[PDB]
Design a protein around this ligand. Structure first.
Ligand SMILES: CCCCCCCC/C=C/CCCCCCCC(=O)O[C@@H](COC(=O)CCCCCCCCCCCCCCC)COP(=O)([O-])OCC[N+](C)(C)C
Ligand SMILES: CCCCCCCC/C=C\CCCCCCCC(=O)O[C@@H](COC(=O)CCCCCCCCCCCCCCC)COP(=O)([O-])OCC[N+](C)(C)C
Ligand SMILES: CCCCCCCC/C=C\CCCCCCCC(=O)O[C@@H](COC(=O)CCCCCCCCCCCCCCC)COP(=O)([O-])OCC[N+](C)(C)C
Ligand SMILES: CCCCCCCC/C=C\CCCCCCCC(=O)O[C@@H](COC(=O)CCCCCCCCCCCCCCC)COP(=O)([O-])OCC[N+](C)(C)C
Ligand SMILES: CCCCCCCC/C=C\CCCCCCCC(=O)O[C@@H](COC(=O)CCCCCCCCCCCCCCC)COP(=O)([O-])OCC[N+](C)(C)C
Ligand SMILES: *[C@@H]1O[C@H](CO)[C@@H](O[C@@H]2O[C@H](CO)[C@@H](O)[C@H](O)[C@H]2NC(C)=O)[C@H](O)[C@H]1NC(C)=O
Ligand SMILES: *[C@@H]1O[C@H](CO)[C@@H](O)[C@H](O)[C@H]1NC(C)=O
Ligand SMILES: *[C@@H]1O[C@H](CO)[C@@H](O)[C@H](O)[C@H]1NC(C)=O
Ligand SMILES: *[C@@H]1O[C@H](CO)[C@@H](O)[C@H](O)[C@H]1NC(C)=O
Lengths: 202, 120, 244, 51, 51
């Protein structure tokens, strides 16, 4: 249901209740629609239409799901309704298929963060470190340009992202968008004791 | 993170620098473990329950006001309101008229063996 | 009829089919091609609309201040009586005097007071603020929703000053020219003018089609029904006169 | 898929993006000011262009 | 622009014509002639095409 907003789905069903009824009004109003289905010697009070209110409302849905129907718009007055309601359908389905082919490829085009070089770009995801441990002392004297740029975040924006303890550092990841940086063994202890966590990177 | 029981903060300024500003925020806190009516802030703290969701982010990260807001639901009903809700009902004021009139035409005027003008 | 054959065209173009039933071998070849004409058009409409909604490649307005000279709908800007405003009022190039011809005759709102005040006019309106080219490169990488369109109009230059007659004019000139070629003077620029994380943009899922995206169809739909009633009364007059 | 890949393909566009394009070869005048600039450059993209 | 060089009217090592041309050059930038001289010679003979 997602590729069309929930006001469009209400506006489509309101239109299908609308255009079917307007076609029903015209069908018992148009003079060039009253035909004779008479196989024999014609013209004896056997001139009728095809459109009930039930029939005109199964021309709406029958042209909305693109299957067609038998109700066969015959008058020039009614075909203009058929000439628009068909064009209303052909844009809605071609905007449903087009947009659903955007949800399923953007979720494929994305890659999860799997390497701290790609975490250097993500300003929306904040870093982390234990306070003045071996990890924090590593970045502030590092030389590799990506790692100094990772220090360039945490130095300028210290204040929240450089948490006090490792047990306190897990809860920031567990309750926010956090990228805590601890020793590689303690990750392998935490990850297999708390199954909702992971190790990204190397 | 004053260790002791009270605090006596001091402002000093003069004729040279009379125009100066600061705005404080204090908070009482006890070390772990942490009983009830005390939101256990992970900052080596325990604050009062009155500080929860009030609007100050005391245990410096917003731990109490983070994960705290009343919200609503029903995305079908998030627009039955002011102007956008009216324009649904304005066209619903159109479509319902097109329905009831389409009741009267089918009931009063049949299909079988009748003259070639009616309708409204 | 001519009416029936023309509701076989549209009836096979919107893919619903019709009842007109091509029966001769002469007519079915028309039906065998016009169906194939439809099946490529709709399958190239759906395919291409599934390219706009997955890769948004947005275009831009003004890209060069000569093309901003035409856009009266987009208003200019300058800091109040800075170096920028004094440049245009004594300029000689006909496009730049014409840019002054707007701001002189219509002063009153478009010649804002301060550079920090000048950013908010761009941020909250259709504004074309004209500041120094370095301060753009500072603002743009610290506020990722902004841009620099155009290039360089004037060529100024900063410079370490000195008193009138001094050895420190010349022996700093030796020193500055070494830092350009060593690469430090560019590296110092990428220490301070480098912004804090502006790649925050990518192909985002459209999340919906709204009335802002597809709303013209309901305009086409409503206009078709109103046209039909004017056609509906058309037979009612035409048949009754031919009945009488 | 044909109509979205060609939209996703961007032109050559800023020498940093020319550092990636091994299919498009570089150039310089022989031992001019330009060639002497890259071989003593320090910026990692420019040394990679010299590489 | 990758590097930033600059052209310049030279002079012998120690000369009054270094300084009193610097006064003269800086006037032509602000008068607009030094840009107008650029659009006399660097302007091409009919490329436009409107792209
Ligand atoms: C805001 C706009 C409002 C405008 C008002 C719209 C009004 C449009 C109205 C439209 C209704 C009428 C037009 C179609 C005819 C219906 C066919 C039929 O029923 O049999 C017809 C047979 O006619 C024939 O013998 C020839 C049929 C083939 C060609 C049809 C005409 C082509 C016009 C193409 C475009 C058409 C117009 C397109 C309009 C866009 C009936 O013929 P007859 O009349 O009974 O013959 C009289 C003989 N008598 C004197 C002896 C009795
Ligand atoms: C291609 C053309 C086809 C055209 C056919 C169109 C109609 C097709 C016919 C039938 C299909 C179903 C009709 C639903 C249409 C709108 C609902 C909607 O927008 O979805 C919303 C709710 O939707 C639901 O989850 C289910 C419906 C909720 C029940 C209450 C409304 C229905 C009552 C009568 C409705 C009519 C009232 C007016 C008439 C009286 C959004 O879904 P969600 O709850 O957020 O999902 C939760 C999961 N998630 C949060 C993780 C995502
Ligand atoms: C009973 C009939 C059945 C026949 C079946 C045939 C099937 C296919 C069989 C074989 C495949 C064709 C391969 C040949 C290569 C095409 C050559 C070409 O370039 O295009 C040609 C165009 O005309 C064509 O495209 C020729 C093929 C279609 C013929 C007409 C449709 C067939 C109708 C029946 C099918 C539907 C009904 C279903 C039938 C049940 C010529 O192009 P050009 O003019 O030289 O361009 C230069 C002009 N310029 C210089 C200005 C640019
Ligand atoms: C029988 C008929 C009676 C009505 C029943 C209809 C049946 C279906 C009933 C309901 C279906 C749903 C409602 C339809 C519109 C959706 C609402 C909406 O907001 O869309 C549009 C509003 O549309 C208008 O305001 C147009 C003005 C009136 C319509 C005129 C139609 C043709 C007139 C006679 C034709 C003459 C014939 C030909 C001669 C020339 C959007 O407009 P916007 O201002 O751009 O929105 C601003 C937001 N934005 C900038 C972010 C985009
Ligand atoms: C018998 C009839 C034959 C005639 C066919 C010719 C078809 C050619 C069609 C259009 C002409 C294309 C040329 C370019 C002009 C487009 C500009 C325009 O008018 O758009 C207008 C809307 O759109 C319409 O109102 C026009 C369509 C009328 C209803 C469709 C019925 C077509 C005829 C029957 C077809 C049935 C099947 C076909 C078989 C017959 C602009 O809208 P607006 O009023 O400015 O809205 C303002 C609101 N706003 C400010 C929010 C934006
Ligand atoms: C998308 O960009 C447009 C153009 O800048 C924004 O429209 C302006 O938004 C500001 C801030 O609300 C308003 O002060 C202006 O009046 C708006 N101008 C126009 C012409 O609408 C728009 O807000 C941006 N979208 C979002 C979601 O912020
Ligand atoms: C992991 O997920 C949630 C926290 O988001 C937690 O409630 C859940 O119990 C955890 N699952 C485990 C520990 O298996
Ligand atoms: C502070 O503490 C008391 C008891 O722990 C609690 O009721 C409340 O959070 C605070 N007091 C008041 C009066 O709000
Ligand atoms: C950039 O502008 C948009 C306005 O559409 C706003 O939503 C966003 O917060 C702005 N970014 C910043 C950093 O102000």
């Amino acid at each position: 249901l997602n590729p069309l907003s929930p006001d469009i789905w209400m506006y489509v069903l309101l239109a299908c209740l609308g255009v079917s009824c307007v076609l029903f009004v015209i069908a018992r109003f148009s003079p060039y629609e009253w035909y004779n289905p008479h196989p024999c010697n014609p013209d004896s009070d056997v001139v009728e239409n095809n459109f009930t209110l039930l029939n005109s409302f199964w021309f709406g849905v029958g042209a909305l799901m693109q299957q067609g129907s038998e109700l066969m718009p015959k008058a020039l007055s009614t075909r203009i309704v058929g000439g628009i309601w068909w064009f209303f359908t052909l844009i809605i389905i071609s905007s449903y298929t087009a947009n659903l082919a955007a949800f399923l490829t953007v979720e494929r085009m994305e890659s999860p963060i799997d390497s701290a070089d790609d975490l250097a770009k993500q300003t929306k995801i904040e870093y982390g470190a234990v306070e003045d441990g071996a990890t924090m002392t590593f970045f502030k004297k590092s030389k590799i340009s990506t790692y100094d740029k990772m220090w360039a975040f945490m130095s300028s924006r210290r204040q929240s992202v450089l948490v006090k303890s490792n047990e306190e550092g897990i809860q920031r990841v567990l309750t926010s968008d956090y990228a805590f940086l601890m020793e590689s063994t303690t990750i392998e202890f935490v990850t297999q004791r708390n199954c909702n966590l992971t190790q990204i990177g190397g | 993170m004053l260790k002791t029981g009270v605090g006596v903060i001091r402002m000093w300024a003069d004729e040279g620098s009379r125009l100066s500003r600061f705005r404080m925020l204090f908070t009482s806190f006890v070390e772990p473990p942490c009983t009830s009516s005390t939101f256990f802030c992970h900052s080596n703290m325990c604050i009062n329950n009155s500080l929860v969701c009030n609007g100050v982010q005391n245990c410096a990260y917003p731990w109490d006001e983070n994960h705290c807001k009343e919200k609503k639901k029903a995305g079908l009903f998030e627009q039955i309101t002011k102007t956008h809700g009216t324009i649904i009902g304005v066209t619903s004021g159109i479509v319902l008229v097109l329905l009831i009139i389409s009741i009267l035409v089918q009931v009063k005027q049949p299909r079988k063996k009748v003259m070639a003008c009616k309708t409204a | 009829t001519l009416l029936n054959s023309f509701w076989f065209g549209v009836g096979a173009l919107m893919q619903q089919g019709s009842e007109l039933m091509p029966k001769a071998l002469s007519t079915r070849i028309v039906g065998g091609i016009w169906w194939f004409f439809t099946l490529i058009i709709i399958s190239s409409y759906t395919a291409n609309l599934a390219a706009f909604l997955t890769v948004e490649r947005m275009e831009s307005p003004i890209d060069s201040a000569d093309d901003l000279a035409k856009q009266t709908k987009i208003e200019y800007g300058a800091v109040e009586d800075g170096a920028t405003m004094t440049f245009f009022k004594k300029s000689k190039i006909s496009t730049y005097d014409k840019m002054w011809a707007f701001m002189s005759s219509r002063r009153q709102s478009v010649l804002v007071k301060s550079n920090e005040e000048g950013i908010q006019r761009v941020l909250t309106s259709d504004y074309a603020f004209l500041m120094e080219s370095t301060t753009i490169e500072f603002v743009t990488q610290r506020n990722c929703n902004l841009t620099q369109i155009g290039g360089l109009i004037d060529s100024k230059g900063y410079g370490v000053g000195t008193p009138m007659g001094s050895p420190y004019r010349d022996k700093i000139t030796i020193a500055i020219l070494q830092l350009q070629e060593e690469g430090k003077l560019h590296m110092m620029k990428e220490k301070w003018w480098r912004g804090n994380g502006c790649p925050e943009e990518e192909s985002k899922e459209a999340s919906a089609l709204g009335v802002q995206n597809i709303g013209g169809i309901f305009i086409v739909l409503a206009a078709g029904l109103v046209l039909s009633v004017f056609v509906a009364v058309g037979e009612f007059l035409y048949k009754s006169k031919k009945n009488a």
